Amino acid sequence: SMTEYKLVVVGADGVGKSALTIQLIQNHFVDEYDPTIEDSYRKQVVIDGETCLLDILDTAGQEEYSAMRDQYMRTGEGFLCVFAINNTKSFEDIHHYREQIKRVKDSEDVPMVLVGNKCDLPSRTVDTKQAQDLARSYGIPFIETSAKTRQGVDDAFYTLVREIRKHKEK
Amino acid sequence: SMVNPTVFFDIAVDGEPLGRVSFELFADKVPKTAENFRALSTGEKGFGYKGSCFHRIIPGFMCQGGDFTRHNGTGGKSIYGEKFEDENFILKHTGPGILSMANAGPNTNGSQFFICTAKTEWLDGKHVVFGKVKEGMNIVEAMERFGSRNGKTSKKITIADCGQLE
Ligand SMILES: Nc1nc2c(ncn2[C@@H]2O[C@H](COP(=O)(O)OP(=O)(O)NP(=O)(O)O)[C@@H](O)[C@H]2O)c(=O)[nH]1
Ligand SMILES: [Cl-]
Ligand SMILES: [Mg+2]
C-alpha cells in the first residue's frame, strides 16, 4: 500500500523543530542554530507495514504571524507540538499551539503528538510527569526526544502518523 | 544632510563587487540607534560590519544582515554592550529603502538590521527605524534577486567595505 501525510512541526523558537526534522530527513544533528522561516521536506517510510510519503512542513517558532500560520494548520493533517525540556516557557506555550490547531481545523479531535525535546541535556526544568499529565488531558501521546542522540526521533513522527490513521478510522 | 551622517556599504556577491549603497542615518530623531550603526560602519570601536553577510534576503520584504560575532544570523553586538533598548518608535516602515533594527523581542537591539524593499507596516512599534537608503536602491534591488522565499541566498552577499561619507 501507499498513502501520504502532511505533517506540520510547531512550537516555540529554539526547541529543536528543525533539528528533529533534519535528523529524520538527513540523519545528522545540526549543532548550529539556523533560525527557520519555512522549510519543507519529503520522505518515504514504512510504518506498521504500510508505506507512506511524509510531507513535513517545518515552521518557525513565531508568535507575530499567527494569521499567516493559520494556512499551514489548515492543510496539515497532524501536528508535532514540540517544547524543550530545559525551556519552561516553551512548555507553557504548548496550550496556545493546541488552541490554534483546534481553531483552524475546527475540531477538538486533531491528530497531534506532544514532543519533549533535548532530553540529553542536564538542565531540565520541565518534569516528565508535568508533560505526561498535559498530554493525558489532551488525549494525545507524549514522546521524549533528543535530536542530538536521535533518541525518539522516528518514534515521534511515526506515532503522529498512527494518530492520523486512528483519526481517519473514526 | 547638515545633521544626519551618511554611511556606505560596498556590497559583494561571492567576493565580486556589486555596487555601493549609502544610507542617511536619522541622528536627528533616533540618535543612539543611528550612532551605533554609524560607528559599526566605520569600525572605529574595533569591530563592526566590514566583512559580514546579508544572511536573510526575502524578495518583496527585506534584506537582513549585520551578524559579525556569530556569523550565522544569531549574533551581533552594539557599541553599548551586547544589547540596547528600543530608543523610540517615531518612524515607521513606510516603504522601500527604510533601514530598521532586527531584534529578538523588546529591547534586544545589537547590530543586526534590515533594509525594507516594500512597506512592512506590521513591524511598526516593534522594530526601531533609524535610517533610509540614500543612493544605490538599485543595488538593494539587485541583492533582493539573490534571495528566496525562506531567505536563503543563492550566492553569498557581503559587506566588502563600509564607512562614513563626508
Ligand atoms: N543538546 C541538544 N541540542 C538540541 C537539540 N535539538 C536542537 N538542539 C539545538 O538547539 C538549537 C535550536 O534548534 P533548532 O532545531 O534550530 O530549533 P527550532 O525549534 O527549529 N528554532 P526556530 O523556531 O527558530 O526555527 C540548535 O543549536 C540545536 O543544535 C537536542 O535534542 N539536544
Ligand atoms: Cl518578524
Ligand atoms: Mg527551525
mmCIF file of C-alpha atoms and ligand atoms in Angstrom:
data_model
loop_
_atom_site.group_PDB
_atom_site.id
_atom_site.type_symbol
_atom_site.label_atom_id
_atom_site.label_comp_id
_atom_site.label_asym_id
_atom_site.label_seq_id
_atom_site.Cartn_x
_atom_site.Cartn_y
_atom_site.Cartn_z
ATOM 1 C CA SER A 1 0.000 0.000 0.000
ATOM 2 C CA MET A 2 0.952 3.674 -0.236
ATOM 3 C CA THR A 3 -0.520 6.739 1.462
ATOM 4 C CA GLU A 4 0.705 10.313 2.052
ATOM 5 C CA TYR A 5 0.536 12.508 5.168
ATOM 6 C CA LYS A 6 1.057 16.239 5.631
ATOM 7 C CA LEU A 7 2.835 16.685 8.966
ATOM 8 C CA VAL A 8 3.424 20.111 10.492
ATOM 9 C CA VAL A 9 6.063 20.739 13.159
ATOM 10 C CA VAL A 10 5.194 23.588 15.545
ATOM 11 C CA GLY A 11 6.487 25.007 18.801
ATOM 12 C CA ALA A 12 8.378 27.890 20.344
ATOM 13 C CA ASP A 13 11.666 29.175 18.960
ATOM 14 C CA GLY A 14 14.790 27.096 19.513
ATOM 15 C CA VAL A 15 13.116 23.961 20.857
ATOM 16 C CA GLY A 16 14.571 21.735 18.122
ATOM 17 C CA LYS A 17 11.830 21.551 15.472
ATOM 18 C CA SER A 18 14.360 21.785 12.650
ATOM 19 C CA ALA A 19 16.921 19.544 14.347
ATOM 20 C CA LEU A 20 14.299 16.819 14.792
ATOM 21 C CA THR A 21 13.189 17.153 11.175
ATOM 22 C CA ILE A 22 16.753 17.163 9.821
ATOM 23 C CA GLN A 23 17.577 14.028 11.819
ATOM 24 C CA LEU A 24 14.589 12.312 10.214
ATOM 25 C CA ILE A 25 15.358 13.534 6.682
ATOM 26 C CA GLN A 26 19.156 13.791 6.640
ATOM 27 C CA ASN A 27 20.300 11.576 9.551
ATOM 28 C CA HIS A 28 22.582 14.163 11.123
ATOM 29 C CA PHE A 29 22.439 16.588 14.028
ATOM 30 C CA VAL A 30 22.977 20.288 13.379
ATOM 31 C CA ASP A 31 24.614 21.902 16.412
ATOM 32 C CA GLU A 32 24.494 25.423 14.964
ATOM 33 C CA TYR A 33 21.226 27.349 15.297
ATOM 34 C CA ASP A 34 19.876 28.321 11.862
ATOM 35 C CA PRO A 35 16.517 30.033 12.548
ATOM 36 C CA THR A 36 13.669 28.879 10.315
ATOM 37 C CA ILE A 37 11.425 30.985 8.125
ATOM 38 C CA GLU A 38 9.837 27.931 6.482
ATOM 39 C CA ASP A 39 11.151 24.630 5.147
ATOM 40 C CA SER A 40 9.530 21.592 3.556
ATOM 41 C CA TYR A 41 10.740 18.003 3.180
ATOM 42 C CA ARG A 42 9.513 14.706 1.745
ATOM 43 C CA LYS A 43 10.484 11.204 2.855
ATOM 44 C CA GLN A 44 9.192 7.720 2.075
ATOM 45 C CA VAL A 45 8.935 5.467 5.134
ATOM 46 C CA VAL A 46 7.234 2.244 6.182
ATOM 47 C CA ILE A 47 5.154 2.447 9.365
ATOM 48 C CA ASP A 48 3.366 -0.636 10.737
ATOM 49 C CA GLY A 49 3.978 -2.376 7.406
ATOM 50 C CA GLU A 50 2.220 0.413 5.467
ATOM 51 C CA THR A 51 4.347 2.514 3.129
ATOM 52 C CA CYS A 52 3.758 6.239 3.103
ATOM 53 C CA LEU A 53 5.192 9.534 1.923
ATOM 54 C CA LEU A 54 5.684 12.098 4.671
ATOM 55 C CA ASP A 55 5.371 15.742 3.604
ATOM 56 C CA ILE A 56 6.864 17.635 6.537
ATOM 57 C CA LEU A 57 6.394 21.384 6.990
ATOM 58 C CA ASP A 58 8.943 22.824 9.421
ATOM 59 C CA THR A 59 7.517 26.100 10.723
ATOM 60 C CA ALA A 60 9.113 28.949 12.602
ATOM 61 C CA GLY A 61 8.669 29.384 16.337
ATOM 62 C CA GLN A 62 6.797 32.643 15.783
ATOM 63 C CA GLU A 63 4.099 34.498 17.692
ATOM 64 C CA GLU A 64 3.619 37.519 15.387
ATOM 65 C CA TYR A 65 2.295 35.959 12.150
ATOM 66 C CA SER A 66 -0.437 33.781 13.674
ATOM 67 C CA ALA A 67 -2.731 34.702 10.775
ATOM 68 C CA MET A 68 -0.149 33.510 8.236
ATOM 69 C CA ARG A 69 0.432 30.468 10.438
ATOM 70 C CA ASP A 70 -3.257 29.532 10.056
ATOM 71 C CA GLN A 71 -2.873 28.408 6.426
ATOM 72 C CA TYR A 72 -0.149 25.959 7.487
ATOM 73 C CA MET A 73 -2.525 24.467 10.018
ATOM 74 C CA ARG A 74 -5.491 24.285 7.649
ATOM 75 C CA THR A 75 -3.794 21.867 5.289
ATOM 76 C CA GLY A 76 -1.809 19.953 7.924
ATOM 77 C CA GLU A 77 -3.183 16.531 8.820
ATOM 78 C CA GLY A 78 -1.169 16.027 12.008
ATOM 79 C CA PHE A 79 0.910 18.232 14.239
ATOM 80 C CA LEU A 80 4.093 17.631 16.173
ATOM 81 C CA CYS A 81 3.934 20.095 19.078
ATOM 82 C CA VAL A 82 7.493 20.479 20.345
ATOM 83 C CA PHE A 83 8.835 22.000 23.549
ATOM 84 C CA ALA A 84 12.305 21.715 25.068
ATOM 85 C CA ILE A 85 12.695 20.047 28.451
ATOM 86 C CA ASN A 86 15.041 22.855 29.574
ATOM 87 C CA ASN A 87 12.757 25.733 28.489
ATOM 88 C CA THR A 88 9.712 26.176 30.728
ATOM 89 C CA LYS A 89 8.327 28.975 28.555
ATOM 90 C CA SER A 90 8.251 26.613 25.565
ATOM 91 C CA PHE A 91 6.175 24.163 27.609
ATOM 92 C CA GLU A 92 3.865 26.958 28.784
ATOM 93 C CA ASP A 93 3.351 27.850 25.107
ATOM 94 C CA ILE A 94 2.028 24.385 24.186
ATOM 95 C CA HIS A 95 -1.599 25.114 25.060
ATOM 96 C CA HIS A 96 -1.534 28.118 22.706
ATOM 97 C CA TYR A 97 -0.434 25.930 19.786
ATOM 98 C CA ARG A 98 -3.155 23.408 20.597
ATOM 99 C CA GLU A 99 -5.814 26.123 20.801
ATOM 100 C CA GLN A 100 -4.602 27.441 17.430
ATOM 101 C CA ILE A 101 -4.682 23.977 15.826
ATOM 102 C CA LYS A 102 -8.200 23.322 17.125
ATOM 103 C CA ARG A 103 -9.415 26.713 15.878
ATOM 104 C CA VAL A 104 -8.006 26.325 12.376
ATOM 105 C CA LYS A 105 -9.057 22.672 11.915
ATOM 106 C CA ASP A 106 -12.458 23.482 13.504
ATOM 107 C CA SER A 107 -12.265 20.410 15.697
ATOM 108 C CA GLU A 108 -11.417 19.275 19.203
ATOM 109 C CA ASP A 109 -10.015 15.995 17.805
ATOM 110 C CA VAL A 110 -6.925 16.769 15.710
ATOM 111 C CA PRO A 111 -4.014 14.302 15.313
ATOM 112 C CA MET A 112 -1.137 15.604 17.392
ATOM 113 C CA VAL A 113 1.807 14.404 19.461
ATOM 114 C CA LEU A 114 3.446 16.311 22.299
ATOM 115 C CA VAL A 115 7.242 16.153 21.965
ATOM 116 C CA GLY A 116 9.616 16.997 24.802
ATOM 117 C CA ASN A 117 12.950 17.524 23.054
ATOM 118 C CA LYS A 118 16.556 17.938 24.280
ATOM 119 C CA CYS A 119 16.306 15.048 26.763
ATOM 120 C CA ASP A 120 20.087 14.602 26.512
ATOM 121 C CA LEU A 121 20.782 17.851 28.372
ATOM 122 C CA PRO A 122 21.442 18.095 32.142
ATOM 123 C CA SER A 123 19.466 21.336 32.639
ATOM 124 C CA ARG A 124 15.886 20.044 32.782
ATOM 125 C CA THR A 125 13.210 22.451 34.008
ATOM 126 C CA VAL A 126 10.052 20.606 32.856
ATOM 127 C CA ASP A 127 9.221 17.371 34.673
ATOM 128 C CA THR A 128 8.223 14.346 32.609
ATOM 129 C CA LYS A 129 5.152 13.964 34.827
ATOM 130 C CA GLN A 130 4.075 17.519 34.020
ATOM 131 C CA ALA A 131 4.254 16.761 30.295
ATOM 132 C CA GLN A 132 2.601 13.344 30.651
ATOM 133 C CA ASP A 133 -0.241 14.963 32.597
ATOM 134 C CA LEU A 134 -0.756 17.633 29.925
ATOM 135 C CA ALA A 135 -0.731 15.031 27.146
ATOM 136 C CA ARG A 136 -3.235 12.915 29.084
ATOM 137 C CA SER A 137 -5.585 15.887 29.469
ATOM 138 C CA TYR A 138 -5.490 16.373 25.684
ATOM 139 C CA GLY A 139 -5.806 12.647 24.996
ATOM 140 C CA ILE A 140 -2.610 12.655 22.910
ATOM 141 C CA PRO A 141 0.710 10.793 23.072
ATOM 142 C CA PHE A 142 3.790 12.275 24.712
ATOM 143 C CA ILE A 143 7.269 11.363 23.426
ATOM 144 C CA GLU A 144 10.628 12.455 24.854
ATOM 145 C CA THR A 145 13.258 13.025 22.172
ATOM 146 C CA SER A 146 16.827 14.117 21.615
ATOM 147 C CA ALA A 147 17.676 15.360 18.137
ATOM 148 C CA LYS A 148 21.320 15.216 19.249
ATOM 149 C CA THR A 149 21.389 11.487 20.079
ATOM 150 C CA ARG A 150 18.457 10.626 17.743
ATOM 151 C CA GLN A 151 16.532 9.135 20.700
ATOM 152 C CA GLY A 152 12.815 9.097 19.946
ATOM 153 C CA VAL A 153 13.049 10.866 16.561
ATOM 154 C CA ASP A 154 11.465 8.117 14.453
ATOM 155 C CA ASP A 155 9.069 7.352 17.310
ATOM 156 C CA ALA A 156 7.716 10.918 17.366
ATOM 157 C CA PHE A 157 6.996 11.091 13.630
ATOM 158 C CA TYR A 158 5.729 7.506 13.362
ATOM 159 C CA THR A 159 3.432 7.978 16.353
ATOM 160 C CA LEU A 160 1.988 11.072 14.671
ATOM 161 C CA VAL A 161 1.223 9.011 11.563
ATOM 162 C CA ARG A 162 -0.504 6.428 13.768
ATOM 163 C CA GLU A 163 -2.587 9.207 15.309
ATOM 164 C CA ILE A 164 -3.636 10.392 11.843
ATOM 165 C CA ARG A 165 -4.537 6.858 10.828
ATOM 166 C CA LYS A 166 -6.580 6.418 14.010
ATOM 167 C CA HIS A 167 -8.387 9.693 13.343
ATOM 168 C CA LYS A 168 -9.233 8.678 9.761
ATOM 169 C CA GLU A 169 -10.803 5.455 11.061
ATOM 170 C CA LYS A 170 -13.434 7.374 13.065
ATOM 171 C CA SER B 1 22.247 66.486 5.397
ATOM 172 C CA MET B 2 23.563 69.111 7.792
ATOM 173 C CA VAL B 3 22.733 66.898 10.805
ATOM 174 C CA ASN B 4 22.390 63.260 9.717
ATOM 175 C CA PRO B 5 25.502 61.202 8.942
ATOM 176 C CA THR B 6 25.797 59.266 5.698
ATOM 177 C CA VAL B 7 27.437 55.845 5.658
ATOM 178 C CA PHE B 8 28.075 53.421 2.819
ATOM 179 C CA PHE B 9 28.286 49.686 2.229
ATOM 180 C CA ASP B 10 30.178 48.282 -0.741
ATOM 181 C CA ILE B 11 28.272 45.074 -1.498
ATOM 182 C CA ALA B 12 29.915 41.938 -2.899
ATOM 183 C CA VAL B 13 28.443 38.789 -4.446
ATOM 184 C CA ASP B 14 30.718 35.784 -3.841
ATOM 185 C CA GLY B 15 33.522 38.316 -3.418
ATOM 186 C CA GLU B 16 32.833 40.214 -6.650
ATOM 187 C CA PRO B 17 31.816 43.882 -6.391
ATOM 188 C CA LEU B 18 28.111 44.526 -6.938
ATOM 189 C CA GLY B 19 27.790 48.203 -6.055
ATOM 190 C CA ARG B 20 27.601 50.780 -3.303
ATOM 191 C CA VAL B 21 24.607 51.509 -1.072
ATOM 192 C CA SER B 22 24.624 54.691 1.004
ATOM 193 C CA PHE B 23 22.335 55.435 3.944
ATOM 194 C CA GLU B 24 21.138 58.554 5.707
ATOM 195 C CA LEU B 25 21.119 57.842 9.442
ATOM 196 C CA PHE B 26 18.407 59.757 11.305
ATOM 197 C CA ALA B 27 20.541 61.019 14.171
ATOM 198 C CA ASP B 28 18.159 63.984 14.466
ATOM 199 C CA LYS B 29 15.314 61.726 15.646
ATOM 200 C CA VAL B 30 16.932 58.419 16.684
ATOM 201 C CA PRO B 31 20.404 59.468 17.885
ATOM 202 C CA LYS B 32 21.527 56.455 19.931
ATOM 203 C CA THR B 33 20.492 53.918 17.301
ATOM 204 C CA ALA B 34 21.893 55.988 14.440
ATOM 205 C CA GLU B 35 25.207 56.402 16.293
ATOM 206 C CA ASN B 36 25.503 52.640 16.833
ATOM 207 C CA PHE B 37 25.077 51.980 13.112
ATOM 208 C CA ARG B 38 27.467 54.803 12.173
ATOM 209 C CA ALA B 39 30.209 53.501 14.487
ATOM 210 C CA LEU B 40 29.722 49.891 13.360
ATOM 211 C CA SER B 41 30.035 51.115 9.760
ATOM 212 C CA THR B 42 33.343 52.903 10.403
ATOM 213 C CA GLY B 43 34.700 50.135 12.631
ATOM 214 C CA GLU B 44 36.081 52.825 14.931
ATOM 215 C CA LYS B 45 35.368 50.798 18.102
ATOM 216 C CA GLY B 46 37.456 47.874 16.818
ATOM 217 C CA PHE B 47 34.570 45.819 15.425
ATOM 218 C CA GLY B 48 31.708 46.276 13.027
ATOM 219 C CA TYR B 49 30.029 45.414 9.758
ATOM 220 C CA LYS B 50 33.009 45.082 7.403
ATOM 221 C CA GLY B 51 33.093 41.515 6.088
ATOM 222 C CA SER B 52 29.700 40.457 7.443
ATOM 223 C CA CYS B 53 26.934 38.783 5.432
ATOM 224 C CA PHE B 54 23.369 39.563 4.412
ATOM 225 C CA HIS B 55 22.184 36.188 5.677
ATOM 226 C CA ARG B 56 18.425 36.532 5.008
ATOM 227 C CA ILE B 57 17.046 38.072 1.808
ATOM 228 C CA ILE B 58 13.334 37.616 1.101
ATOM 229 C CA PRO B 59 12.095 39.176 -2.157
ATOM 230 C CA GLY B 60 9.226 41.563 -1.604
ATOM 231 C CA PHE B 61 10.096 42.094 2.057
ATOM 232 C CA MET B 62 13.636 42.850 3.185
ATOM 233 C CA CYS B 63 17.382 42.210 3.182
ATOM 234 C CA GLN B 64 18.730 41.445 6.670
ATOM 235 C CA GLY B 65 22.349 41.368 7.816
ATOM 236 C CA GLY B 66 24.814 42.534 10.416
ATOM 237 C CA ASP B 67 25.894 39.438 12.398
ATOM 238 C CA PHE B 68 29.646 39.966 12.774
ATOM 239 C CA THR B 69 30.023 37.975 16.021
ATOM 240 C CA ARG B 70 28.499 34.544 15.330
ATOM 241 C CA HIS B 71 28.495 34.918 11.520
ATOM 242 C CA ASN B 72 25.344 32.788 11.309
ATOM 243 C CA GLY B 73 22.321 35.071 11.863
ATOM 244 C CA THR B 74 22.035 34.607 15.626
ATOM 245 C CA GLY B 75 24.624 37.105 16.826
ATOM 246 C CA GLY B 76 25.700 40.707 16.756
ATOM 247 C CA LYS B 77 26.545 43.344 19.345
ATOM 248 C CA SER B 78 26.190 47.092 19.723
ATOM 249 C CA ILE B 79 28.672 49.782 20.693
ATOM 250 C CA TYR B 80 26.835 49.958 24.049
ATOM 251 C CA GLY B 81 27.164 46.317 25.040
ATOM 252 C CA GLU B 82 25.612 43.169 23.684
ATOM 253 C CA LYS B 83 22.124 44.725 23.517
ATOM 254 C CA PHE B 84 20.415 48.092 23.940
ATOM 255 C CA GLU B 85 16.865 49.265 24.477
ATOM 256 C CA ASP B 86 14.367 50.305 21.832
ATOM 257 C CA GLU B 87 15.067 54.036 21.615
ATOM 258 C CA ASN B 88 11.756 55.195 20.112
ATOM 259 C CA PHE B 89 9.136 54.255 17.526
ATOM 260 C CA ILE B 90 8.780 57.722 15.973
ATOM 261 C CA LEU B 91 9.498 56.487 12.440
ATOM 262 C CA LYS B 92 7.543 53.777 10.643
ATOM 263 C CA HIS B 93 8.238 51.146 7.983
ATOM 264 C CA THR B 94 6.752 53.206 5.200
ATOM 265 C CA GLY B 95 8.303 51.698 2.070
ATOM 266 C CA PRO B 96 11.376 50.538 0.168
ATOM 267 C CA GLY B 97 14.730 51.692 1.495
ATOM 268 C CA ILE B 98 13.786 52.004 5.173
ATOM 269 C CA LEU B 99 16.629 50.925 7.490
ATOM 270 C CA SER B 100 15.497 49.345 10.753
ATOM 271 C CA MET B 101 16.890 47.242 13.609
ATOM 272 C CA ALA B 102 16.404 43.489 13.717
ATOM 273 C CA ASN B 103 15.746 42.065 17.168
ATOM 274 C CA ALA B 104 14.582 39.092 19.217
ATOM 275 C CA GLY B 105 11.840 40.940 21.076
ATOM 276 C CA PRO B 106 11.711 44.129 23.151
ATOM 277 C CA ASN B 107 14.987 45.877 23.957
ATOM 278 C CA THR B 108 17.308 43.420 22.180
ATOM 279 C CA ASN B 109 18.961 45.673 19.593
ATOM 280 C CA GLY B 110 22.523 44.666 18.791
ATOM 281 C CA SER B 111 23.954 45.084 15.309
ATOM 282 C CA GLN B 112 21.577 43.196 13.029
ATOM 283 C CA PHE B 113 19.497 45.404 10.771
ATOM 284 C CA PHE B 114 17.257 45.126 7.749
ATOM 285 C CA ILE B 115 16.561 47.164 4.621
ATOM 286 C CA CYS B 116 12.927 47.130 3.538
ATOM 287 C CA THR B 117 12.126 46.509 -0.114
ATOM 288 C CA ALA B 118 8.408 47.185 0.456
ATOM 289 C CA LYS B 119 6.161 48.717 3.081
ATOM 290 C CA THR B 120 6.251 46.458 6.180
ATOM 291 C CA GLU B 121 3.755 48.229 8.420
ATOM 292 C CA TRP B 122 3.225 45.235 10.732
ATOM 293 C CA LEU B 123 6.753 45.859 12.085
ATOM 294 C CA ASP B 124 5.836 49.366 13.312
ATOM 295 C CA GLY B 125 6.226 49.697 17.049
ATOM 296 C CA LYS B 126 8.342 46.534 17.278
ATOM 297 C CA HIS B 127 11.482 47.473 15.290
ATOM 298 C CA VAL B 128 13.278 50.795 15.579
ATOM 299 C CA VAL B 129 13.504 52.617 12.237
ATOM 300 C CA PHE B 130 16.618 54.783 12.140
ATOM 301 C CA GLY B 131 17.669 55.462 8.553
ATOM 302 C CA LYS B 132 16.951 55.146 4.869
ATOM 303 C CA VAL B 133 18.789 54.278 1.683
ATOM 304 C CA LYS B 134 20.092 57.490 0.115
ATOM 305 C CA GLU B 135 21.843 56.208 -3.013
ATOM 306 C CA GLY B 136 22.018 52.738 -4.503
ATOM 307 C CA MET B 137 18.466 51.446 -4.155
ATOM 308 C CA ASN B 138 19.089 49.719 -7.494
ATOM 309 C CA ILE B 139 21.861 47.785 -5.726
ATOM 310 C CA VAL B 140 19.449 46.728 -2.970
ATOM 311 C CA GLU B 141 17.045 45.606 -5.692
ATOM 312 C CA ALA B 142 19.907 43.596 -7.212
ATOM 313 C CA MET B 143 20.620 41.963 -3.841
ATOM 314 C CA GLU B 144 16.943 41.073 -3.457
ATOM 315 C CA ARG B 145 17.181 38.836 -6.534
ATOM 316 C CA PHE B 146 19.691 36.561 -4.774
ATOM 317 C CA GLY B 147 17.117 35.793 -2.077
ATOM 318 C CA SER B 148 14.354 33.232 -1.872
ATOM 319 C CA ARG B 149 11.054 32.520 -0.143
ATOM 320 C CA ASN B 150 12.794 31.296 3.030
ATOM 321 C CA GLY B 151 15.538 33.924 2.967
ATOM 322 C CA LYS B 152 18.409 31.662 1.944
ATOM 323 C CA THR B 153 20.626 33.319 -0.653
ATOM 324 C CA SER B 154 21.825 31.629 -3.838
ATOM 325 C CA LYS B 155 25.198 33.400 -3.576
ATOM 326 C CA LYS B 156 26.972 34.924 -0.593
ATOM 327 C CA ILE B 157 26.133 38.621 -0.218
ATOM 328 C CA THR B 158 28.657 40.512 1.907
ATOM 329 C CA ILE B 159 29.643 43.984 3.056
ATOM 330 C CA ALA B 160 33.077 44.065 1.438
ATOM 331 C CA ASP B 161 33.785 47.592 2.678
ATOM 332 C CA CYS B 162 31.929 50.209 4.666
ATOM 333 C CA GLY B 163 32.474 53.600 6.222
ATOM 334 C CA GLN B 164 31.234 57.151 6.644
ATOM 335 C CA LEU B 165 30.967 59.707 3.841
ATOM 336 C CA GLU B 166 31.584 63.436 4.164
HETATM 337 N N1 LIG C 1 21.533 19.243 23.080
HETATM 338 C C1 LIG C 1 20.553 19.385 22.180
HETATM 339 N N2 LIG C 1 20.506 20.484 21.428
HETATM 340 C C2 LIG C 1 19.467 20.484 20.567
HETATM 341 C C3 LIG C 1 18.514 19.512 20.390
HETATM 342 N N3 LIG C 1 17.612 19.887 19.401
HETATM 343 C C4 LIG C 1 18.045 21.057 18.996
HETATM 344 N N4 LIG C 1 19.171 21.474 19.667
HETATM 345 C C5 LIG C 1 19.895 22.727 19.470
HETATM 346 O O1 LIG C 1 19.012 23.785 19.765
HETATM 347 C C6 LIG C 1 19.219 24.875 18.840
HETATM 348 C C7 LIG C 1 17.912 25.197 18.150
HETATM 349 O O2 LIG C 1 17.481 24.062 17.367
HETATM 350 P P1 LIG C 1 16.546 24.251 16.112
HETATM 351 O O3 LIG C 1 16.232 22.879 15.637
HETATM 352 O O4 LIG C 1 17.137 25.242 15.120
HETATM 353 O O5 LIG C 1 15.288 24.889 16.825
HETATM 354 P P2 LIG C 1 13.893 25.377 16.109
HETATM 355 O O6 LIG C 1 12.797 24.917 17.008
HETATM 356 O O7 LIG C 1 13.882 24.835 14.704
HETATM 357 N N5 LIG C 1 14.055 27.014 16.092
HETATM 358 P P3 LIG C 1 13.143 28.047 15.099
HETATM 359 O O8 LIG C 1 11.744 28.140 15.684
HETATM 360 O O9 LIG C 1 13.860 29.420 15.155
HETATM 361 O O10 LIG C 1 13.192 27.513 13.704
HETATM 362 C C8 LIG C 1 20.373 24.451 17.934
HETATM 363 O O11 LIG C 1 21.606 24.963 18.435
HETATM 364 C C9 LIG C 1 20.334 22.925 18.025
HETATM 365 O O12 LIG C 1 21.602 22.312 17.804
HETATM 366 C C10 LIG C 1 18.579 18.329 21.216
HETATM 367 O O13 LIG C 1 17.820 17.367 21.207
HETATM 368 N N6 LIG C 1 19.650 18.363 22.085
HETATM 369 CL CL CL C 2 9.148 39.433 12.146
HETATM 370 MG MG MG C 3 13.708 25.774 12.946
#
